Amino acid sequence: DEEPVKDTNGNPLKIETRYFIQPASDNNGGGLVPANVDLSHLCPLGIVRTSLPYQPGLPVTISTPSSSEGNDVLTNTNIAITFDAPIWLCPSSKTWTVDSSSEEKYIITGGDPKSGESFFRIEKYGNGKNTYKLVRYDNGEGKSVGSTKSLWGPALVLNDDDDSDENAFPIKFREVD
Amino acid sequence: NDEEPVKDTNGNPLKIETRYFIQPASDNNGGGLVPANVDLSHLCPLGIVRTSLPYQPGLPVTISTPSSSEGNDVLTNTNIAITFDAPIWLCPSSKTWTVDSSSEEKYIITGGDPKSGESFFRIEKYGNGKNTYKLVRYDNGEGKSVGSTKSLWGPALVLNDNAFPIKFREVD
Amino acid sequence: EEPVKDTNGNPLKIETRYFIQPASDNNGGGLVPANVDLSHLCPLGIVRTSLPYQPGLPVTISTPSSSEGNDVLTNTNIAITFDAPIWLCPSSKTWTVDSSSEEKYIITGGDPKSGESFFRIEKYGNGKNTYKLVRGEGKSVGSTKSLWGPALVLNDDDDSDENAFPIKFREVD
Amino acid sequence: DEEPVKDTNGNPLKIETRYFIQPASDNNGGGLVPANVDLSHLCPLGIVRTSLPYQPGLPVTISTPSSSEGNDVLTNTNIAITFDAPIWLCPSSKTWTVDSSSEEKYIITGGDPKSGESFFRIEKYGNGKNTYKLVRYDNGEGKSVGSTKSLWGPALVLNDDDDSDENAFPIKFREVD
Ligand code: CLA
Ligand code: CLA
Ligand code: CLA
Ligand code: CLA
């Protein structure tokens, strides 16, 4: 719970800083971007892995509840992920959160920055360096963020647990300058 | 006062909780009024636009009467609420018309509370044409009528800061 | 070769706007242009709208033969073309079978004068003014689940009204 | 002419090589991408400067009609530009050409890289290193590629002249590793 998260260059992640959250896994597409999960709703937005190979993803900024790391972002700690964008087609926030009414638990936008529903934790994934997985604790239980088939491709969804990395969607943080 | 029954294209009095297409008075170009984005900055909520396809009737609405319980006739000059009727909705808000108070155009949009003063309009006779009306809203004192402006897909209803004449066509 | 009839029992005339509407148990409305998948926006497929009161997009009918008056008779090569004041794709509003793909989607952009877009309208079941499309005449037009909903597709080597998409024509005015 | 076109790293451009064609005028946006120019047609596609800050643009590969200078690309020489993508929503080709039928003379996709109607010329552009501009040839006169306001943003159009860089949309080429 004390090992600071690092970007693709091995440097410590910092808040108020832009990063591309890119799949560490299957290198046959691009980064994570907003997109609707299905044709039932266009808002709020889900999180997909773009199929276009050199599209980096839409940048995010990592926020922190209590000044206890100055600007640093530590592992197994409460953080909030917010897409950074000059344009937003939905009347809700860009902060990540979970769709509880979704009977599939898609990771969606619209979450509240300071609220606890938008809380996620970054854990080390497997053994690759600077590689991680995301995990949320809805009501005490720990579940890792995975992915599932959606309209536009694989969309981030909450798994039933965090017992093993097997179902986790591995990610890396690439600094945007 | 003055409060007479609003009538549909067949001259029949309007009934609450009944589907009607709201269509522009003159059957010139386009079809009925439908939900559509007004610009490229937002998908939701939705504006009210006249479709340019000539045989599209428009998306039906139901009318509810806020301040009244007096039979099932909709009357002119009486607060009423307008709600689109559809089996599906792509936005995370209601199908009720209201005013986009915070837009320099005062677009009429979806997502209002059918029981809040925000979503109340009054139907008044328009010009000569029989069974022709206009929608009017009161910020409270003085009333402004619903007109239109050009938007992404076509004319979009806006609160006039002439009115956009409409008629009601019973569904089926 | 008896006349195809609309919902009023009137025979269809060529170059007259008609709504093609699903002659079956009714969840949705008429046939309209829509994209079949996320791989292409153009050309367009034929999809049944899920909205209750959407008539469908209008279509006109044309005949390769020019000696049967203006009557659109059953079992006679005809060309179905969407009628609209605007079109967002480079090709034609005429229906045709996507020669190549799996489900042989019926698509837009055909040549009303080419035999590539000729269809046949024939009686469907022992009903009233209910038909189907076939393609001299042998493959029946059925449907299959697509992006927006049922999309028209040509069926394999069969015409029996078991896997055919039931339709009625409603005159527009 | 004989001089080589250089990418952002000052290296010579090569054929069959993916590059991002990025605007050199501002930092108020991202690279060049396919987008429809107006609501009248979805296909073919125009070339628009995306407003999203970190979108690099959709890669393009450069081709030479002639089988002369191997895989080299030199200024003042005839070349065709073609988008590179595993997905394409329009029937037509990914090759750039001029829409001679529009009053705006929008640069659109669907051209024939082998036909002279898709050929363009990369020439130097005023201030800054490795900065260029594109010019097309009517017959005897050159017309630089500029841009005009379109539905989704600045769209490339064929200018009137090439008397100055004044109305030319400057670009640079960034190799897509
Ligand atoms: C509100 C609805 C919404 C929807 C529908 C989408 C949908 C999509 N976005 Mg997201 N996005 C949104 C809001 C939305 N976005 C917002 C508010 C932002 C902040 C501005 C972004 C930022 C963003 C980024 C940074 C990226 C995406 C990308 C994508 C695409 C990912 C799948 C893919 O790789 O296909 C492969 C790609 C294609 C088939 C070409 C897509 C062309 C798009 C731009 C327009 C399509 C137009 C038209 C409506 C076609 C759909 C028809 C419909 C019937 C299916 C997908 C089309 C990624 C992408 O690939 O963009 C091009 C990407 O890199 N989006
Ligand atoms: C979520 C956002 C949303 C948006 C973007 C729209 C947008 C639109 N709607 Mg509304 N609608 C919505 C939600 C939405 N709708 C909901 C929730 C309902 C209830 C279920 C409806 C019910 C509805 C009806 C009943 C009707 C409309 C119609 C229309 C069109 C009116 C303008 C016109 O006449 O063009 C003329 C038509 C065209 C140019 C062809 C239509 C093309 C559409 C289907 C797709 C465009 C997407 C394209 C691939 C990407 C380009 C996007 C552009 C901004 C660059 C316009 C495209 C009218 C229409 O004509 O529909 C076809 C109409 O009759 N809508
Ligand atoms: C070029 C691409 C294209 C595409 C993708 C579509 C797609 C669609 N059309 Mg078709 N259409 C087109 C061209 C196109 N059209 C042309 C050129 C014409 C002639 C002008 C028409 C005429 C037409 C008619 C007359 C009708 C359709 C309708 C429909 C809808 C049928 C499914 C349904 O019942 O949902 C029900 C409706 C909804 C789920 C809400 C959708 C509202 C539409 C208007 C806009 C959606 C925009 C949204 C932001 C797209 C993003 C998707 C995301 C995955 C990227 C579907 C959305 C039917 C319809 O229901 O229209 C509303 C209908 O009646 N279209
Ligand atoms: C077929 C029609 C088509 C159309 C309509 C577009 C349209 C667009 N493309 Mg292009 N594109 C296409 C085909 C198409 N594309 C193809 C075949 C490819 C190769 C696969 C691409 C590859 C591509 C790339 C690589 C990129 C684009 C981008 C964009 C956007 C640039 C403007 C901008 O900066 O907005 C700023 C962004 C927004 C307003 C939010 C993005 C919304 C997108 C994802 C969906 C829009 C559909 C929406 C439901 C309907 C409109 C609603 C209205 C209220 C806005 C614009 C939305 C750029 C972009 O910004 O992508 C996200 C970009 O980087 N496109």
DSSP A86-140: S--SSSS-SEEEE-SS-TT-BEEEEE-SSSGGG-BEEEE-SSSTT-EEEEEESSS
Q: Which residues of A touch B38 (CB under 8 A)?
A: none
Q: Is C27 in the pocket of ligand 3 (CB under 6 A)?
A: no
Q: Do residue B55 and residue C85 have CB atoms under 8 angstroms apart?
A: no
3-state secondary structure of B118: helix
Q: Which residues of C touch D40 (CB under 8 A)?
A: 86, 88
Tokens of A103: 């009977």
Distances (CA, A) of A46 to A111, A151, C112: 12, 10, 43
Pocket (CB within 6 angstroms of ligand 2): A 42; B 31, 34-37, 43, 46, 49, 51-53, 56, 59, 86, 88-90, 153-154; C 41, 51, 54, 86, 88; D 39, 42
Distances (CA, A) of B138 to B47, B99, B133, B146, C5: 20, 11, 16, 11, 52
Closest-CA distance of chain C to residue A53, Å: 16
Radius of gyration of chain C from its Cα atoms, rounded to whole angstroms: 15
Closest-CA distance of chain B to residue A24, Å: 32
Which stretch of DSSP H or E encloses residue D62? strand D60-63
**Chains with at least 3 CB pairs less than 8 angstroms from chain D:** A, B, C
Q: Which of B17, B34, B38 is nearest to B107 (CA)?
A: B38
Beta bridge partners of C114: none
DSSP C89-153: SSS-SB-EE-SSSSS-BEES---TTSGGG-BEEEE-TTSSS-EEEE----PBEEEEE-SSSEEEE
Domain map of chain B by residue range?
1-172
HSE (side-chain half, CA atoms, 13 Å) at D117: 13
The span from the CA of A159 to the CA of A171, in Å, is 15
The span from the CA of D45 to the CA of C42, in Å, is 12
Peptide bond into C90 cis (omega under 30): no
CB C38 within 8 A of CB C104: no
Query: Which residues are CB-contacts of D169 (< 8 A; sequence separation ≥ 6)?
Result: D23, D25, D133, D134, D144, D145, D146, D147, D154, D156
Q: CA angle, B40 as apex, B36 and B46 as ends, to 5°?
A: 30
Q: Is A60 in the pocket of ligand 1 (CB under 6 A)?
A: no
Which stretch of DSSP H or E encloses residue B22? strand B20-24
The span from the CA of D81 to the CA of D93, in Å, is 11
The span from the CA of C132 to the CA of C138, in Å, is 12
Polymer length of chain A: 177
Cα nearest neighbour of A59 on chain D: D54
The span from the CA of B127 to the CA of A59, in Å, is 55
The C-alpha torsion from D104 through C41 and C108 to D114, rounded to 10°, is 60
The span from the CA of B138 to the CA of D132, in Å, is 58
Q: Please, which experimental method was used?
A: X-ray
Query: Which residues are CB-contacts of D166 (< 8 A; sequence separation ≥ 6)?
Result: none
Q: Which of B97, B74, B95 is nearest to B17 (CA)?
A: B74
**What are the backbone angles phi and psi of residue B119, rounded to the nearest 5°?**
-100, 30
Residue found by looking up tokens 């059925």 in the block: C142
The C-alpha torsion from D105 through D111 and D117 to D122, rounded to 10°, is 80
The C-alpha torsion from A129 through A133 and A139 to A140, rounded to 10°, is -30
Closest-CA distance of chain D to residue A86, Å: 7
Distances (CA, A) of D164 to B57, D128, D133, D171: 54, 16, 11, 15
Beta bridge partners of B73: B15
Mutation target among A36, A39, A41 for the B interface, most CBs of B within 10 A: A41
Peptide bond into C43 cis (omega under 30): yes
The span from the CA of D63 to the CA of A96, in Å, is 43
Ligand nearest to the backbone CA of C35 = 3
Residue found by looking up tokens 């029996």 in the block: C160
Cα nearest neighbour of A40 on chain C: C148
Which stretch of DSSP H or E encloses residue D20? strand D19-23
Residues of D with CB under 8 A from a CB of B: 39, 151-152
CB D144 within 8 A of CB D163: no
Question: D1-177 adopts what CATH topology?
Answer: Trefoil (Acidic Fibroblast Growth Factor, subunit A) (2.80.10)
User: Which is the closest atom of ligand 3 to the Cα of C47?
Assistant: 31
Tokens of D154: 């600045």
CA B33 – ligand 2 centroid, Å: 11
Residue found by looking up tokens 């005449």 in the block: C137
Question: B1-172 adopts what CATH topology?
Answer: Trefoil (Acidic Fibroblast Growth Factor, subunit A) (2.80.10)
Resolution as reported, in Å:
2.0
Mutation target among C36, C38, C44, C89 for the D interface, most CBs of D within 10 A: C89
CB D152 within 8 A of CB D35: yes
CA C56 – ligand 1 centroid, Å: 28
Which regions of B95-154 does DSSP assign to beta strands (E)?
98-99, 108-109, 122-125, 133-138, 143-150
- The answer on whether A13 is annotated among ligand-binding residues is no
C146 alpha carbon, distance to own chain's centre: 16
The span from the CA of D77 to the CA of B5, in Å, is 76
Beta bridge partners of C18: C59, C171
Closest-CA distance of chain C to residue B61, Å: 12
User: Which is the closest atom of ligand 2 to the Cα of B43?
Assistant: 2
Distances (CA, A) of C132 to A31, B8, C21, C139: 47, 37, 11, 11
The span from the CA of A61 to the CA of A17, in Å, is 5
The span from the CA of A85 to the CA of B10, in Å, is 51
The span from the CA of C114 to the CA of D111, in Å, is 26
Beta bridge partners of A159: none
Burial state string for B137-149 with b = 16 or more CB within 10 A and e = fewer than 16: beeeeeebbbbbe
The span from the CA of A146 to the CA of A129, in Å, is 19
| Burial of D80 (C-beta count, 10 Å sphere; 0-12/13-18/19+) | buried
CATH annotation of C1-173: 2.80.10.50
User: Which is the closest atom of ligand 4 to the Cα of A42?
Assistant: 49
Q: Which residues of C touch B59 (CB under 8 A)?
A: 51
Q: Which residues of A touch D55 (CB under 8 A)?
A: 55-56
**What are the backbone angles phi and psi of residue A144, rounded to the nearest 5°?**
-90, 150
